[PDB]
Amino acid sequence: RSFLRFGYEVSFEALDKGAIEILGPYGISYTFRRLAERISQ
Amino acid sequence: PKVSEDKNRNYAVVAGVVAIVGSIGWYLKA
Amino acid sequence: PKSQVTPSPDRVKWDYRGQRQIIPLGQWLPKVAVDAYVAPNVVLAGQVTVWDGSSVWNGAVLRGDLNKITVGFCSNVQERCVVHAAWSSPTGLPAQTLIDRYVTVGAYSLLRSCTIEPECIIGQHSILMEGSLVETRSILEAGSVLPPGRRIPSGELWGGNPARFIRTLTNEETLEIPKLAVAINHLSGDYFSEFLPYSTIYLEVEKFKKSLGI
Amino acid sequence: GSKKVSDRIVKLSAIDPDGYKQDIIGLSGQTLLRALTHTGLIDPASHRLDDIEACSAECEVQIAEEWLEKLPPRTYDEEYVLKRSSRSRILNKHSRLGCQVVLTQELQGMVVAVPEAKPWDI
Amino acid sequence: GTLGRAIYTVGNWIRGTGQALDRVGSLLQGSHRIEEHLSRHRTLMNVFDKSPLVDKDVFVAPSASVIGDVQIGKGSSIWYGCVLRGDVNNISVGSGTNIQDNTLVHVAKTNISGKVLPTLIGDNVTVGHSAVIHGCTVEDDAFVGMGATLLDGVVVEKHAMVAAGSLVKQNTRIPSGEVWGGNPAKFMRKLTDEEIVYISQSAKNYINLAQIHASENSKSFEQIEVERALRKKYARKDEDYDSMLGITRETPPELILPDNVLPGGKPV
Amino acid sequence: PDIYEGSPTPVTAFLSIAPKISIFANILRVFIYGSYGATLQQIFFFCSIASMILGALAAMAQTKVKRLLAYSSIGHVGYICIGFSCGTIEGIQSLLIGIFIYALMTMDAFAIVLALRQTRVKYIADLGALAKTNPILAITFSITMFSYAGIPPLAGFCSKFYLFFAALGCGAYFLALVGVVTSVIGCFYYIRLVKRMFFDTPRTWILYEPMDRNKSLLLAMTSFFITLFLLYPSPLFSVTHQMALSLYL
Amino acid sequence: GTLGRAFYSVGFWIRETGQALDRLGCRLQGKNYFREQLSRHRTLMNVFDKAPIVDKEAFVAPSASVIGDVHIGRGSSIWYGCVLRGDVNTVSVGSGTNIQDNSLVHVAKSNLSGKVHPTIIGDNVTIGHSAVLHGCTVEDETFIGMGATLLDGVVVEKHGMVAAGALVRQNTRIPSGEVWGGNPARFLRKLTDEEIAFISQSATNYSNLAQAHAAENAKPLNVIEFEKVLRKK
Amino acid sequence: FLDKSEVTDRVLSVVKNFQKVDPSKVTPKANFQNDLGLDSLDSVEVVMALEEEFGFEIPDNEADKIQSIDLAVDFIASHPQAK
């Protein structure tokens, strides 16, 4: 049971779920939408 | 009816024939 | 009561040119795409537009003399189909006969001012009267007639002389609908390669003229 | 009975810029710009696509203040498109987008005012 | 002169070479393709010493086939793909009554029921597209919807309508003011006055519309080329350059339709 | 961008190619004498960095085809000015190669735009179902867009490659990073267009009329050049190296 | 096969080149008669090797369109406006039948619906006006009514009559001697001896009529009409 | 569209300027020529005053149809030009 929890609640839930995503290409890197649109200035 | 009547079109035909012959000679003589 | 007619002595009983396929009405000239196949027996009169991949088959008449007629991309009008347009429709919508993309029109289909949304199948002997809408992804059964102002809901199969609801189309059929249009387009393209850009009939006309002088 | 096209006909009152009021006919489930296109009030060649990204407010319309509550609220894209083409970077606070208004049977008798035309060729 | 004669001879040589190439290409095809021939389709044809009596003002489409003993009145029209086979018995078409596209009018063998009568179509009648008539006696000022089939022995009385996609069974009489329709062709409803006005207006509109088709289907080769050139020349316009040049190009009358066939009679 | 958008499309095609060649020739014949203590190398350094950054960040917020082309032109001008910043024979050679490749790609793209201009194309979403109606024009446009992006197999990659090589030769490592980031952004908004033609399924389609012969041959020749340039790029490099050396001797 | 198609396409290329040369030769002489818009309709049209086989003693109207593998027996007749298109499969028309005016006898245009069934017509079979025979089969000495809409998979047995305007649904068998009518087709009544005799006599009547129609269609084309069309002022 | 309050005020205010119209009888439903005993000249004068307080125009076929102030105020409330 501990290994089954170790499979989902950590390795799948936190390491590679959104933590890489948020610092990756679309979690916060989508600020280019909030950056390219400002070029009209 | 063995005569082509349009003088302008005849001159265009002569010019085209001359252009083709001159191009062939140009590619051959040089 | 008259019971009296005056035959014309200049009436032509045999036109050596045959029936002209493209019949312009004043400034309205039918527009046929180079990719589209129109059978030599077809008559296109008035403002009729045939788009890419479309096909019109033998015996079909597309008279756009009154209002505009449009045949969409990869949509086919099959053998002996009369497509006509009226000045106005009962519903109040514009009466242009518009056939959208991937629409299959079965043979002996009579369309008048009807609008057919994309990806539809119209059965044989189907009559679409003025101001009738056929919603997208719908199939109309063969021999079905719908009166003016009637509508076929999207995703349903309809049939019968006073066209009624039959059942609801499944996903496989509504995804197979455009594939039938694509296959018919392939067949039309196979027919399209049998005709050269210019016919060689004018040589026979010249031979006939020489047989009688000039 | 049967399924009539009249079962989804939405009557509307569209006003051209010079103040004339003509009654247009639309279909429930299609954009209000499509309904305006049928009579020819808005040139079809200017807004051929009913899509938000293919729009520079060629379909801008003025909805009545009492009839603006029975409509979805303006999205961010609609506001952004409206502001840029306003020629003054101001919001009229009651103007919508034709391509973003979907007709509904609850919109019977909605009065809409079409502003003046704008150039769109290039 | 001499240059013209030389160019004519060169053209003759080129034509001969082209025809030889066409023959060789036909040989390589295996002689499988059936060569297109001169049109042998006769618009008006005789069967048994009987000739059609088409009137001067009638518009008979070149693709139509008026065959046998057919009598057609003034102002009427026979449209594209229509067949009027009056070989076995008589067919009489009234004045101002148009027979629309792909319609078929045929007469029974004078013995289909023993007391068969010729196909009589009255005045100012309109017959819809792809309709089939096989021995009816349609009276004047009547309507036959597109796709309707009228079997032998039927009579359509004055100011009566047959719904589109109907099948009037044999020996069936449609009384005046009814809208008989359906596959059994049973009573549907009574005719309103607006429907009568619509019938008359449709007949008059078709009489009006046959004229442009008649004027277009009878043009010569020389006129067709001129009209095609004019249509190409005036297809697109440039008002700015004309204003710069001080000219106003106007559409020639050969490309202008009469205002009586436009949707609302547009003068401009 | 306003001038490019408002100008007629055949006019916009000519101003995007012809003036740049001659103006760059003038700038080169000024650099042969005007190298006053590398004063222009700094100005062109800042101008090229800013041009790349602004073009990359501005062409993503464009919905019209002509404004996107204008911002692409600005970005490629910055990429070419990278060569100006590094004053060397290899720098000038990279500059001229980039000018040639950019001119050919621009001619290709503007011929494609003029082909669709006959049906009043204004937005990128208009060319949505082009992969269905004209499945070869969509391929040609995708090839041109990828060449703009700089994908290795195409001809547009060679110019960016050799410009980056010239930049790294002079020791300007900061130019290389800016060029790399701008290239990533450029490829993103260039494949964004390719997404619309092939992957989207618009509800309403726009059908374009067939193109004419002149633009057809121009597109065919330029598309064969773009795809098959890497196989035989020797003549361009030879003529460019000969040109760069002849600026002084 | 595939070898034949290549030769067919090469023949098309060479024929196109020859026609272009002929047009160029005409242009040098100033003639422009090749621009005339003559009708390209052929009463017998083939699709590669699939060419219709029509017996000598068979009337085919000039306006009738016969395409693909179509076989016409002796004494049969295809009247005006008929479209007999069998390309993906064959259309077999027996001896003594009569495809009457504006009728349509074709085969399915694609394999998506399944297997394309060849259309078979028996002997002394009467096909009514404007009737659709879409991939069905009919036995000899049968009658098909006016406006009938037989679909594919339908077998009409010998001495079977289909009433006018009836629509026979897919995969339906009409038993011998029974009349099927209405939409959809359903049993109505059993045929009588008099109707059988009339059905037999109608075939002979139309066979005799077709001979006269062919005789009137085989006359040499009138030269007065040709001259009148030539000079139009 | 316009709210009923302002149009009701604008039709209740101007009608009291005819030196004979009773202020006690004017209301959202009060016919001009019938309920107030007006003249046809006043029947067209009220319509003219409707286009005297604004710039819009009433066609000659829209003035003699209904002489009722309820339909008049409804039409005024359905006037996009006014505010």
Ligand SMILES: CCCCC/C=C/C/C=C\C/C=C/C/C=C/CCCC(=O)O[C@H](COC(=O)CCCCCCCCCCCCCCCCC)COP(=O)(O)O[C@H]1[C@H](O)[C@H](O)[C@@H](O)[C@H](O)[C@H]1O
């Ligand atoms: C089977 C084995 C052989 C198999 C190989 C066979 C080969 C056949 C031999 C030669 C093939 C020649 C190919 C050369 C073809 C050139 C292109 C054809 C050009 C051409 O339209 O014709 C002339 C034009 O006049 C010239 O402005 C320029 C035209 C000048 C060139 C024409 C001179 C052709 C003489 C060739 C020498 C013939 C010598 C004898 C050859 C035959 C052997 C006995 C007709 O003008 P046009 O106003 O009436 O009309 C044209 C024409 O309709 C179209 O171009 C346009 O639509 C229209 O706007 C208008 O321009």
Ligand SMILES: CCCCCC(=O)OC[C@H](COP(=O)(O)OC[C@H](N)C(=O)O)OC(=O)CCCCC
């Ligand atoms: C050997 C055959 C020469 C035949 C020469 C010839 O026909 O020129 C015409 C063609 C097409 O030009 P058109 O649009 O006038 O078609 C006219 C067309 N004939 C028609 O029927 O419409 O020109 C070329 O592209 C060929 C350029 C290269 C020419 C070498």
Ligand SMILES: [Fe+3]
């Ligand atoms: Fe919009």
Ligand SMILES: [Zn+2]
């Ligand atoms: Zn018959």
